[PDB]
Structure 1
Amino acid sequence: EPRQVFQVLEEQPPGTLVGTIQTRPGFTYRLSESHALFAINSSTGALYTTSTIDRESLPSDVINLVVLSSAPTYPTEVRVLVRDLNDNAPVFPDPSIVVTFKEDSSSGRQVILDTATDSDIGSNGVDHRSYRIIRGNEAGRFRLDITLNPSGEGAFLHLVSKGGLDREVTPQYQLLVEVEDKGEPKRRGYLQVNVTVQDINDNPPVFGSSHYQAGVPEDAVVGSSVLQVAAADADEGTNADIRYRLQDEGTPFQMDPETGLITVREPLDFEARRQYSLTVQAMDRGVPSLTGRAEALIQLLDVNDNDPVVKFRYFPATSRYASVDENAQVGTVVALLTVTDADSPAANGNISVQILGGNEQRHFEVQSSKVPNLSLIKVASALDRERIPSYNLTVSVSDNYGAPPGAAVQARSSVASLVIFVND
């Protein structure tokens, strides 16, 4: 019939006094069963612990025993309450976690964190109102938001951005979060929160120079390198991967999209086009892609790649032979000698015409006029068809005439013949 109630603190030395049952004169007392935790003094009815009890280790902190008497037996039901100490701290599921905000997230964007638990009874358990940022928030970019579940079961913690995150200034934060329990000596737990700031494509590529400049000889072979451009992009990953391109796609140059090297793809020709002022673009691989631009001035350098040519001009122009009457006075123009060389005066040097046989009798002469590249072929002496009816004059023309040995420019040359019949 009778029932008594004792309490004992956990974590106490073996042999701690639990309680003493209310005895009756002339009885002794034993436990009805052997108990792992307790033992009874049979003459006093005092109950003692046999080991150090861990309340967190028990299936139940209420234990039910039955004390039995000697003599004519009666039973005594005992209830032992194992009382809790605040000997566990609040703990997080992981000592450290990682969370991510996008740079240029709006003020008030949040991301969820972990909450703590505590293995003591609820009155020594986590105070879910106490979560606090204690280190790492020097810049004042963050605050905590706590949500206590209205049903009384548990809580949720969130980290809230106050806006103004810029990955290119601060890509990483490390916050320390402290939570308290509610126990006699207050205990604390801690969570390290690593904050990654995720990159957006907010920076465009930028060329190292806004004006490039290259010089290229017109005989540069295909595949040869012309000018290397390079841009930088202050973002990360794909957002800063740059592809280069020329704006005008109809030139004889070529831009490798990944290296920014401009090479020659089609043969150049100074005589056709001396210089190309081109716009180069650099484009990142972000979505919203962004673009930078620069200017590139490629001047071609003239090469001596054209022979000088001599043409004769004379009065049956539809014929391949000139004619001169035997009666023509000394000084009569018989033909013009015009030189054409498509290169520029730099690559050409001096151009000179020289007579290569045919005029052994000195009946004609070749005379430079006062106009560049035109000579006159005149009658120099009396003629008569009976002695000589025809002549064949051969002239050679040459650019870079009189150049010293070891000069950088090789001279080019051609020959031309003019035959002259005498009429009467």
Structure 2
Amino acid sequence: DWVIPPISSPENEKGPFPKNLVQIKSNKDKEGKVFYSITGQGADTPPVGVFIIERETGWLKVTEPLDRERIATYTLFSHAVSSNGNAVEDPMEILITVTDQNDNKPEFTQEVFKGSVMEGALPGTSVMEVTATDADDDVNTYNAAIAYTILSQDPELPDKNMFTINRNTGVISVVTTGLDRESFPTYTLVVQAADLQGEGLSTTATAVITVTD
């Protein structure tokens, strides 16, 4: 049967609402009046009324902002009923895809990560790993594409930058010499995860590194 292509609608649209999505029609409307209705999640089942249809014109409308991270896709069915009460079409499946906006900051899997490193560790030695996730669309956008950086180190001794981080993997490695358990046994790093390949929304967490013998 001839049907409508999937409709795309972005999340977080600003008003006014409602907004038109598509106008549908039954050509049985040349035989008399036809009334249009829609069913399905987002229509007549929870969340009810997010989408509505104009009963005489066939204009399908969205009534409020969408959220791809709550519902990314809707399946509705349109119905066409004669003024005399009989269904004049088999219901038509209508697909609505919510497209992404960058509206979730990355979030570290926990607030504090801990690690240890031996004081004689060669420069280049992997120490620990920090990890963040991003609830945005990683298939179609860079809105969930996380880069990792170090914002600070405490103490800043013997050097300000004892460590470096892999911007893609969140692996923290020793980058210089002079670790000394008997002097500075613990380093606290503030680390950042930022989406859009480092350029977007961001969050921070802490990496606490113990220097061992």
Normalised to the residue count of structure 2, the TM-score between the two structures is 0.72
**Aligned 8 A contact 1:220 1:264 in 2:** no
SS in 1 for 2:45: coil
**C-alpha distance in 2, partners of 1:263/1:221?**
14
Instruction: Find the counterpart in structure 2 of residue 358 from structure 1.
Output: 153
The Cα shift of 1:393 comes to 0.7
The alpha-carbon distance between structure 1 residues 323 and 349, as it changes in their structure 2 partners (threshold 3 A), is closer
The Cα shift of 1:304 comes to 0.7
Instruction: Find the counterpart in structure 2 of residue 343 from structure 1.
Output: 136
- CA deviation profile, 1:243-290 (whole Å, cap 9, x unmatched): 422255336432235253333457533245433343211112204x23
**C-alpha distance in 1, partners of 2:110/2:127?**
10
Query: Partner letter of residue 106 of structure 2?
Result: P
The Cα shift of 1:386 comes to 2.8
Percent of aligned positions with the same letter in both sequences? 31
**Aligned 8 A contact 1:366 1:375 in 2:** yes
The Cα shift of 1:358 comes to 0.7
1:416 and 2:205 correspond: yes
Matches within 5 A, 1:22-61: none
Query: Partner letter of residue 340 of structure 1?
Result: T
Matches within 5 A, 1:51-200: none
1:230 and 2:27 correspond: no
Moved over 4 A (4+): none
User: Which structure is larger by alpha-carbon Rg, 1 or 2?
Assistant: 1
The Cα shift of 1:226 comes to 4.7
The Cα shift of 1:357 comes to 1.6
SS in 2 for 1:268: coil
2:182 is aligned, of 377, 386, 390, to 386
Can you give the 5+ residue segments of structure 2 that lack an aligned partner in the other structure? none
The alpha-carbon distance between structure 1 residues 330 and 294, as it changes in their structure 2 partners (threshold 3 A), is same
The alpha-carbon distance between structure 1 residues 349 and 423, as it changes in their structure 2 partners (threshold 3 A), is closer
**Aligned 8 A contact 1:243 1:282 in 2:** yes
1:250 and 2:39 correspond: no
SS in 1 for 2:135: coil
Compare relative contact order (CA 8 Å, sep 6+) and give the higher one, 1 or 2.
2
The alpha-carbon distance between structure 1 residues 211 and 328, as it changes in their structure 2 partners (threshold 3 A), is same
Can you give the 5+ residue segments of structure 1 that lack an aligned partner in the other structure? 1-208, 314-318, 404-410
**Aligned 8 A contact 2:162 2:174 in 1:** yes
**C-alpha distance in 2, partners of 1:392/1:402?**
22
Q: How many residues align?
A: 196
The Cα shift of 1:321 comes to 4.4
Instruction: Find the counterpart in structure 2 of residue 398 from structure 1.
Output: 194
- CA deviation profile, 1:12-60 (whole Å, cap 9, x unmatched): xxxxxxxxxxxxxxxxxxxxxxxxxxxxxxxxxxxxxxxxxxxxxxxxx
The alpha-carbon distance between structure 1 residues 312 and 243, as it changes in their structure 2 partners (threshold 3 A), is closer
RMSD in angstroms over aligned alpha carbons?
Answer: 3.3
The Cα shift of 1:339 comes to 2.9
Query: Partner letter of residue 351 of structure 1?
Result: I
SS in 1 for 2:204: strand
